[PDB]
Symmetry: D2
Subunit: 349 residues, 4 copies
């Protein structure tokens, strides 16, 4: 083998999805493919958007989180709303005694993260966060090779590059609603991947640089973080919202005896060219392309959500815990401080 045994048709878990936008849709599609899941509610401030998602999966639609929480069959809530709404919404879901999966970034301050985590534990519920790429099949494989100590020797370098042409919806570009720019949006993943590839060691210091390119908004479009891990390995996170030509996500680990690299979007092994356009391909879809296949599964969403559901229904302890989210949140806060005053920031947390 080995093929993981298939879910498991038979338990029933009532689910609410809060935020029926892009990511709420992905989760709705991933969760409804799981035989154990009953999607009961879509919650959204925009009723048209909420309604469109709900009818697609035969859920009920509401604009009030409290209506869904009044449904006793709901035991699990997915929160995919703008970043600054995560903490109030997750705090209320937890207080109502429900399990909750919160999209990246968990919250926007170290305090909120520690306190949300303490509140979930007290309430005896699962708090899970949406760092999907550490569940991506390709990266899991690469993580396994990066852990071969005989093969790599002493690891000294890790690098994660994550580049897009930027967000589609407006809330991403305001601090008030988003917390920060590319460093928050993409840097979340890059920092989680870096830690993880190294075996989650303590971070000793951080250095960072950011720029805002776009006139719209008040957040950065690009950032580079230099992370100093406790063993002395240097991490780099290179993120950007101003990169054309298609999403890029790569991971590189370098030791004294070996190295491991992995490429998500440019490593799918399919190539195409056309003089006109490919209908079934994400724009840009003319000229030379490297088309994706199974983008949802290959980004890790399917494995993440299966393991979250396994944690709620079967008490199967998760690989990635609120401790990991807390570590990411303080790294990002340290990075923003470093960028602001042009100095290395010592960690301690």
């Amino acid at each position: 083998g080995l093929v993981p045994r298939g879910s498991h048709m038979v338990e029933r878990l009532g689910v609410a999805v809060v935020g029926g936008g892009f990511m709420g849709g992905v989760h709705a599609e991933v969760l409804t493919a799981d035989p154990r899941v009953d999607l009961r509610w879509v919650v959204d401030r925009d009723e048209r958007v909420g309604t469109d998602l709900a009818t697609r999966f035969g859920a009920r639609v509401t604009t009030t989180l409290d209506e869904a929480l009044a449904d006793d069959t709901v035991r699990f809530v997915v929160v995919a709303t703008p970043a600054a709404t995560h903490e109030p919404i997750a705090a209320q879901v937890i207080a109502a005694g429900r399990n909750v999966l919160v999209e990246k970034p968990l919250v926007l301050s170290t305090g909120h993260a520690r306190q949300l985590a303490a509140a979930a534990h007290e309430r005896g519920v699962v708090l899970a966060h949406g760092g999907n790429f550490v569940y991506a099949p390709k990266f899991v494989r690469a993580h396994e090779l990066a852990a071969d100590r005989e093969a790599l020797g002493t690891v000294h370098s890790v690098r994660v590059a994550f580049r897009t042409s930027g967000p589609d919806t407006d809330w991403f570009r305001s601090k008030a609603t988003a917390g920060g720019g590319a460093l928050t949006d993409l840097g979340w993943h890059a920092v989680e991947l870096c830690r993880w590839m190294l075996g989650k060691p303590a971070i000793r210091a951080v250095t960072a640089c950011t720029r805002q390119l776009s006139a719209a908004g008040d957040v950065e479009d690009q950032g580079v973080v230099l992370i100093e891990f406790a063993d002395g390995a240097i991490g780099q996170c290179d993120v950007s919202w101003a990169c054309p030509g298609g999403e890029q996500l790569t991971v590189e680990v370098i030791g004294t005896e070996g190295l491991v690299t992995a490429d998500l979007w440019q490593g799918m092994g399919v190539e195409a060219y056309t003089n006109t356009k490919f209908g079934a391909v994400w724009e840009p879809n003319q000229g030379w392309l490297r088309p994706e296949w199974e983008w949802i599964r290959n980004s890790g969403y399917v494995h993440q959500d299966r393991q979250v559901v396994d944690a709620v229904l079967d008490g199967r302890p998760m690989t990635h815990t609120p401790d990991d989210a807390v570590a990411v949140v303080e790294t990002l806060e340290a990075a923003y401080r470093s960028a602001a005053d042009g100095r290395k920031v010592e960690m301690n947390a």
Copy 2:
């Protein structure tokens, strides 16, 4: 919730893979392993909690068994499959379905008459990456007129002895690897009829009496040319690539070198298929990525829900004929016309 009782015949490498794939299906109950070698069958049975026997009829006496996977040497396929169908069971037969076109048509007809599912083990037409490439290649506006398809399949050759005997394998690389190459070529073009086949083969190793490499040029009805390039003599790692070229566009897909992970070591990687020293391109999820999971899900779906199959015994017959024509072409040094 719908349980399906399954028996696996042949407890070797492929029986092992199928057993792994089917027992991951919540609908499936693996009840029997059948194998002529009792030690091999016992090992597989104890691993998956099934009964074991050396006699297929002991497993067919079990009325719970409604579906049988046949993963035995090529020449044993037809007698076994005929038996299974005669006993009213649905069957999946590993590639080379059969060695003769007459036998293929009989089995299909016998299966249709009995009202059972006959399925064949061409797993790579179910591989997720190839399935995506096939979708792109079907965009007529994007590709214009399709005039070339090429499938290269290269390995360092089989390890068990019966593969290199003509009596039991029915062929060498052209059969073992060519089955897939031809099925992929055909499929990438939307499955058009084949009009002619030219082929060249060669035996390299001294062991056995079958070819180690071969090339087939295929003339499809519309005039597009297919190339199938297969070999048991290629070092450095398995290769499987697909290429479709039209006047306005093209599509390529690479299975084993397009998996997007690179590694280097001065020593070795323990978790990697040898060669595991120096520069490597390691696989991940090789069973799923090769198409076995999707194949076996769609065959179980057919048996349970009557949901009609994408790849049919008609496809398998087309492949058998082509391989028959290719071996004749290789012997006669001439293009062979397909009156079928």
Copy 3:
């Protein structure tokens, strides 16, 4: 090292170029960069084209081959005219006692090739042919590794693929003027590369398939040749005029212990993307590109012409001789016969 010593400024060789089209221009540019070369004449039936090339290099222009041959300073003639004109023109250049470089394909029949070669030898002049890719730096390197017998073991497979979107000028698509289509135009190179990569062994048999896609003309757009070499290795030449997206040229050699591959146009190590267009790039020049650098030198034209000039001026014997051209010509003639009647053709020549 090692860097080849630089030409050698000082000898003077008067040159005529016949055919001032695309390839006559390339040669004019390569030859005038050689300090030893004096480009005296451009000969072309079209005076405007001839004149445009000549003024660019300060040559004289004529429409009569005889005018250039009346110039005693001319000792070396480059023939870059349509394929069917090669034999008469080269026969006249040779008879006038001049050295001659004839573009691919040398001539269109085995007889003509043997007889042209015999005539040059009798006249004591160099006859050279324009198979440039066997001089391409990258392929020379690959040829050297393919000759490591310990590293490859027994070589059993060689493959050359050569694909373009087809010729620009009309004469290429008529048998009368061109001899044949892609199999002649591209197959010339593919067959020469195959032989060479294997150490130029005898060819025992040939099998071939061709199709005509285009309505214009009467020659084939695609062809595949299966070559059986004497040692038992199988060669493949895959050529096409109907391939979009940019020129492709690759070489693959496979043995029992190893393999060697090389990629000319997709192996240049430069990548680019733009949302608009790159001005300095060969169309298609939008979207994802793999731009060439030094395309003339990297295709081998510079090394070929330097070695041809070395042969004339310094008697330095050439690596690739008229014997090699004769072998290619009969392979192609065998291939066309095989395609015509659907049978393997045994060689003997």
Copy 4:
């Protein structure tokens, strides 16, 4: 036809390369090899038919010598170059030109006053592939606003001992490799001014007292961010890549992994730099492709034909300052502002 008399100082690895490159130039007469080790200098001299000495002044007493290549350890560069310029000779000094910004400005000024050519050994800005990438990256309509440049330069480290001594090398990887990284970054953007530099370094090996790896973030005047990533601790083969990203486009170039030749062997390739087992990506024409040939042709052109140089001592000063600022940043844990 115009002959230029040359002396090479330092008969080691780089002196060897330069001697190879310059003697291929028909305009050049290599007359002297100078080296403190007589055996090393003698070996190089006998190979190229030059005179040999251990005393630079014996070679400067020769009035035929109009041009000197200095390929000695970093700390020896300034005293030697000063001597050569003081004697009225044109000079080419290998990378790290000098270790101090003051010294760089003196040499440039001394050279300008004497009326001679001072050139520095940044060969990769002359590499044909990078020169092409630089042309693409200069297409403003195609790239839009340029906001990122990244240069990664990775090796398994130097083999001679003086490289790992601060006294004689003036630095580790950040100096040895970083010189190129910074010069490439700067050049790819059209050579704008540098406003600030942040850096992090680390020593891995126990031997020596210099860093093995370092990263530099560079803030250019317009606001574009440069990254220079260098390391002596990277296995599997040398890497050198360049990346430029703008809002409308991007350009990347790969020197050692973008050479387009792939090989595999179960044994080894004799004609290949080790690692020469397993999967390889072999180099071809490494001297020319690294830029040495073009560099040395353009320096000889300058000396003979007064044809002004693309890369000037002003560029070298900019690089020296940046490296100075980077090492301070690495020590202080802070961004260093460039008031130059």
